[PDB]
Design a protein around this motif. Structure first.
Motif, PDB file in Angstrom:
ATOM      1  N   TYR A  23       0.850  -1.192   0.000  1.00  0.00           N
ATOM      2  CA  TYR A  23       0.000   0.000   0.000  1.00  0.00           C
ATOM      3  C   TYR A  23       0.883   1.238   0.000  1.00  0.00           C
ATOM      4  O   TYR A  23       1.619   1.478   0.972  1.00  0.00           O
ATOM      5  CB  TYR A  23      -0.882   0.007   1.243  1.00  0.00           C
ATOM      6  CG  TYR A  23      -2.028  -0.981   1.232  1.00  0.00           C
ATOM      7  CD1 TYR A  23      -2.955  -0.995   0.189  1.00  0.00           C
ATOM      8  CD2 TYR A  23      -2.221  -1.859   2.299  1.00  0.00           C
ATOM      9  CE1 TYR A  23      -4.016  -1.873   0.188  1.00  0.00           C
ATOM     10  CE2 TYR A  23      -3.291  -2.759   2.308  1.00  0.00           C
ATOM     11  CZ  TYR A  23      -4.187  -2.752   1.238  1.00  0.00           C
ATOM     12  OH  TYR A  23      -5.255  -3.625   1.236  1.00  0.00           O
ATOM     13  N   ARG A  59      -7.795  -6.159  -1.663  1.00  0.00           N
ATOM     14  CA  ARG A  59      -6.956  -4.985  -1.418  1.00  0.00           C
ATOM     15  C   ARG A  59      -7.759  -3.699  -1.481  1.00  0.00           C
ATOM     16  O   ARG A  59      -8.575  -3.517  -2.391  1.00  0.00           O
ATOM     17  CB  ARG A  59      -5.860  -4.888  -2.493  1.00  0.00           C
ATOM     18  CG  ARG A  59      -4.861  -6.029  -2.510  1.00  0.00           C
ATOM     19  CD  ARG A  59      -3.837  -5.910  -1.365  1.00  0.00           C
ATOM     20  NE  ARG A  59      -2.906  -4.795  -1.586  1.00  0.00           N
ATOM     21  CZ  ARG A  59      -1.881  -4.489  -0.792  1.00  0.00           C
ATOM     22  NH1 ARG A  59      -1.650  -5.213   0.303  1.00  0.00           N
ATOM     23  NH2 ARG A  59      -1.078  -3.465  -1.096  1.00  0.00           N
ATOM     24  N   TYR A  60      -7.550  -2.810  -0.510  1.00  0.00           N
ATOM     25  CA  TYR A  60      -8.123  -1.471  -0.571  1.00  0.00           C
ATOM     26  C   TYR A  60      -7.529  -0.689  -1.727  1.00  0.00           C
ATOM     27  O   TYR A  60      -6.299  -0.664  -1.899  1.00  0.00           O
ATOM     28  CB  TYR A  60      -7.787  -0.689   0.692  1.00  0.00           C
ATOM     29  CG  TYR A  60      -8.473  -1.179   1.930  1.00  0.00           C
ATOM     30  CD1 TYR A  60      -9.861  -1.101   2.053  1.00  0.00           C
ATOM     31  CD2 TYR A  60      -7.735  -1.698   2.995  1.00  0.00           C
ATOM     32  CE1 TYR A  60     -10.509  -1.543   3.205  1.00  0.00           C
ATOM     33  CE2 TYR A  60      -8.372  -2.135   4.161  1.00  0.00           C
ATOM     34  CZ  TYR A  60      -9.758  -2.054   4.250  1.00  0.00           C
ATOM     35  OH  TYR A  60     -10.409  -2.489   5.388  1.00  0.00           O
ATOM     36  N   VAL A  67     -12.502   4.691  -1.009  1.00  0.00           N
ATOM     37  CA  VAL A  67     -11.526   3.602  -1.014  1.00  0.00           C
ATOM     38  C   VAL A  67     -12.347   2.335  -0.799  1.00  0.00           C
ATOM     39  O   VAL A  67     -13.167   2.269   0.137  1.00  0.00           O
ATOM     40  CB  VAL A  67     -10.514   3.776   0.129  1.00  0.00           C
ATOM     41  CG1 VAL A  67      -9.586   2.576   0.233  1.00  0.00           C
ATOM     42  CG2 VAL A  67      -9.726   5.063  -0.073  1.00  0.00           C
ATOM     43  N   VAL A  68     -12.157   1.345  -1.678  1.00  0.00           N
ATOM     44  CA  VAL A  68     -13.058   0.186  -1.707  1.00  0.00           C
ATOM     45  C   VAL A  68     -12.322  -1.134  -1.923  1.00  0.00           C
ATOM     46  O   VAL A  68     -11.140  -1.161  -2.323  1.00  0.00           O
ATOM     47  CB  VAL A  68     -14.154   0.330  -2.815  1.00  0.00           C
ATOM     48  CG1 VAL A  68     -14.925   1.656  -2.695  1.00  0.00           C
ATOM     49  CG2 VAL A  68     -13.545   0.186  -4.201  1.00  0.00           C
ATOM     50  N   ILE A  69     -13.039  -2.228  -1.666  1.00  0.00           N
ATOM     51  CA  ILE A  69     -12.626  -3.570  -2.065  1.00  0.00           C
ATOM     52  C   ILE A  69     -13.835  -4.251  -2.716  1.00  0.00           C
ATOM     53  O   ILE A  69     -14.854  -4.451  -2.047  1.00  0.00           O
ATOM     54  CB  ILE A  69     -12.179  -4.460  -0.887  1.00  0.00           C
ATOM     55  CG1 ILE A  69     -11.140  -3.743  -0.011  1.00  0.00           C
ATOM     56  CG2 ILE A  69     -11.656  -5.783  -1.435  1.00  0.00           C
ATOM     57  CD1 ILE A  69     -10.626  -4.554   1.167  1.00  0.00           C
ATOM     58  N   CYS A  78     -10.804 -10.721   4.029  1.00  0.00           N
ATOM     59  CA  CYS A  78     -10.973  -9.718   2.975  1.00  0.00           C
ATOM     60  C   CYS A  78     -12.261  -8.943   3.199  1.00  0.00           C
ATOM     61  O   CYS A  78     -13.352  -9.483   2.996  1.00  0.00           O
ATOM     62  CB  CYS A  78     -11.015 -10.383   1.596  1.00  0.00           C
ATOM     63  SG  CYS A  78      -9.570 -11.368   1.187  1.00  0.00           S
ATOM     64  N   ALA A  79     -12.138  -7.685   3.620  1.00  0.00           N
ATOM     65  CA  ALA A  79     -13.291  -6.793   3.805  1.00  0.00           C
ATOM     66  C   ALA A  79     -14.284  -7.329   4.837  1.00  0.00           C
ATOM     67  O   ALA A  79     -15.501  -7.158   4.706  1.00  0.00           O
ATOM     68  CB  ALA A  79     -13.988  -6.514   2.461  1.00  0.00           C
ATOM     69  N   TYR A  86     -17.239  -3.204  -1.068  1.00  0.00           N
ATOM     70  CA  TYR A  86     -17.074  -2.817   0.325  1.00  0.00           C
ATOM     71  C   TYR A  86     -16.385  -1.463   0.406  1.00  0.00           C
ATOM     72  O   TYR A  86     -15.332  -1.262  -0.195  1.00  0.00           O
ATOM     73  CB  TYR A  86     -16.251  -3.859   1.056  1.00  0.00           C
ATOM     74  CG  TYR A  86     -15.937  -3.485   2.487  1.00  0.00           C
ATOM     75  CD1 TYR A  86     -16.872  -3.684   3.501  1.00  0.00           C
ATOM     76  CD2 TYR A  86     -14.699  -2.937   2.831  1.00  0.00           C
ATOM     77  CE1 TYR A  86     -16.583  -3.336   4.829  1.00  0.00           C
ATOM     78  CE2 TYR A  86     -14.404  -2.583   4.147  1.00  0.00           C
ATOM     79  CZ  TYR A  86     -15.348  -2.791   5.136  1.00  0.00           C
ATOM     80  OH  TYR A  86     -15.054  -2.452   6.439  1.00  0.00           O
ATOM     81  N   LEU A  88     -14.454   1.367   2.559  1.00  0.00           N
ATOM     82  CA  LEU A  88     -13.692   1.677   3.762  1.00  0.00           C
ATOM     83  C   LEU A  88     -14.278   2.907   4.427  1.00  0.00           C
ATOM     84  O   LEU A  88     -14.439   3.953   3.800  1.00  0.00           O
ATOM     85  CB  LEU A  88     -12.223   1.920   3.418  1.00  0.00           C
ATOM     86  CG  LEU A  88     -11.317   2.340   4.580  1.00  0.00           C
ATOM     87  CD1 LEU A  88     -11.199   1.256   5.619  1.00  0.00           C
ATOM     88  CD2 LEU A  88      -9.966   2.691   4.000  1.00  0.00           C
ATOM     89  N   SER A  91     -10.281   4.922   8.751  1.00  0.00           N
ATOM     90  CA  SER A  91      -8.856   4.604   8.699  1.00  0.00           C
ATOM     91  C   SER A  91      -8.075   5.832   9.119  1.00  0.00           C
ATOM     92  O   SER A  91      -8.500   6.951   8.821  1.00  0.00           O
ATOM     93  CB  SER A  91      -8.462   4.199   7.281  1.00  0.00           C
ATOM     94  OG  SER A  91      -7.058   4.029   7.183  1.00  0.00           O
ATOM     95  N   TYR A  96      -3.050   3.743  -0.335  1.00  0.00           N
ATOM     96  CA  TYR A  96      -3.689   2.465  -0.651  1.00  0.00           C
ATOM     97  C   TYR A  96      -3.172   1.980  -1.997  1.00  0.00           C
ATOM     98  O   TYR A  96      -2.131   2.447  -2.469  1.00  0.00           O
ATOM     99  CB  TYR A  96      -5.228   2.617  -0.625  1.00  0.00           C
ATOM    100  CG  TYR A  96      -5.741   3.084   0.723  1.00  0.00           C
ATOM    101  CD1 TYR A  96      -5.911   2.183   1.778  1.00  0.00           C
ATOM    102  CD2 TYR A  96      -6.034   4.435   0.955  1.00  0.00           C
ATOM    103  CE1 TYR A  96      -6.358   2.612   3.023  1.00  0.00           C
ATOM    104  CE2 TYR A  96      -6.474   4.879   2.218  1.00  0.00           C
ATOM    105  CZ  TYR A  96      -6.649   3.946   3.217  1.00  0.00           C
ATOM    106  OH  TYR A  96      -7.085   4.349   4.461  1.00  0.00           O
TER     107      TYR A  96
END
Ligand SMILES: *[C]([O])C1(*)(*)N(*)(*)[C@](*)(*)C(*)(*)C2(*)(*)(*)=C(*)(*)C(*)(*)=C(*)(*)C(*)(*)=C12(*)(*)*
Length: 150
Positions: A23, A59-60, A67-69, A78-79, A86, A88, A91, A96
């Motif tokens: 990241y 991964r974000y 910011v997503v997965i 994972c998420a 998903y 975020l 944080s 990322y």
């Protein structure tokens, strides 16, 4: 002076890019990176369509606005076992991976290799595109336009 860009298959034009396998991309660098691939940060709608064609990561990464997965299969690591895109929420930190969207890609799954960074500019950095199958394309150039990222 070298940068590795790990890239995925495209799904409805959307793909994931990880810089140096960790990241390490800011929001400004993410926009510049997608621009180097003649791409843009995906909208949420573009990402949801990609997900529907089979796109998922663990991964974000930046899209436009969040910011997503993307998740298809529930996985505890994972998420937090979510499916769908998903988002975020909380944080401390700012760096990322990124997602990118190329409108000229095929409409569904494209798991062919990426073999150019067509919109990179003149510069001193050895930039290597690394595909998941190990295929590599290198060129000397630059893509970062913000000093704070260099
Ligand atoms: C996966 O998907 C990710 N991560 C790890 C490393 C790599 C390489 C290439 C492409 C992608 C990736």
């Amino acid at each position: 002076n070298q940068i590795d860009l790990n890239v995925t298959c495209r799904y409805a034009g959307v793909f994931h890019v990880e810089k140096n396998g960790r990241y390490s991309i800011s929001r400004t660098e993410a926009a510049d990176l997608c621009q180097a691939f003649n791409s843009t940060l995906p909208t949420m709608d573009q990402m949801k369509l990609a997900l529907s064609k089979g796109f998922e990561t663990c991964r974000y990464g930046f899209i436009e606005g969040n910011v997503v997965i993307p998740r298809i299969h529930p996985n505890a690591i994972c998420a937090a076992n979510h499916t769908g895109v998903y988002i975020l929420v909380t944080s401390n930190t700012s760096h990322y991976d990124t997602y990118c969207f190329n409108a000229s890609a095929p409409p569904e799954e494209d798991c062919t290799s990426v073999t150019d960074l067509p919109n990179s500019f003149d510069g001193p950095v050895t930039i290597t595109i690394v595909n998941r199958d190990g295929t590599r394309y290198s060129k000397k150039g630059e893509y970062r336009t913000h000093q704070e990222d260099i």
